[PDB]
Amino acid sequence: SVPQARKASLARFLEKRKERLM
């Protein structure tokens, strides 16, 4: 479902940001 696909891509988006510190 579209809200799930959103939550998944968003989680991955955040992680990639959280990963530049890390």
Add this chain to the structure above:
Amino acid sequence: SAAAPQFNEDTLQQRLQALIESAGENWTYAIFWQISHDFDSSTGDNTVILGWGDGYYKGENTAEQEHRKRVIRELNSLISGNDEEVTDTEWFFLVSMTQSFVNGVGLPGESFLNSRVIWLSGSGALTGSGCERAGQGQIYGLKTMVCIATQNGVVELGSSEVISQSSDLMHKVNNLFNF
């Protein structure tokens, strides 16, 4: 929201990453708009809607910046579930996740309905197009925006660089998103 298990599916983000990382030109992001169906409460209606499937963001005021960081923290808290700039292309990518397109409508709906490739190269092309998604992307620094219809949806590509339609990139998208 609050507010706004197959092969081809387990393999989607990998294929998006592969498209971007294995490409001749420098692309900023790739989005896959997926086919979904809405059913109307009044009638029997199978309407095709293009929703957010998945994406891969590669990349390359202060008032605006802290608005953006708030949202990211709010989203962070909701999703799970030390601070630097949120760029325009990142923001556009992010906000794209809430967007949808009725079949035939907007750059992706346009692309899917007509099984078409829409290639907008250069700022003039984007703004001159008169489609608001193209105008939005141009506002946020994209100089090139592409929609390629595939069997399950539309692959959107964008870049802050000007890129002419490559025949090689067409083949890439076909290999990765068909079948």
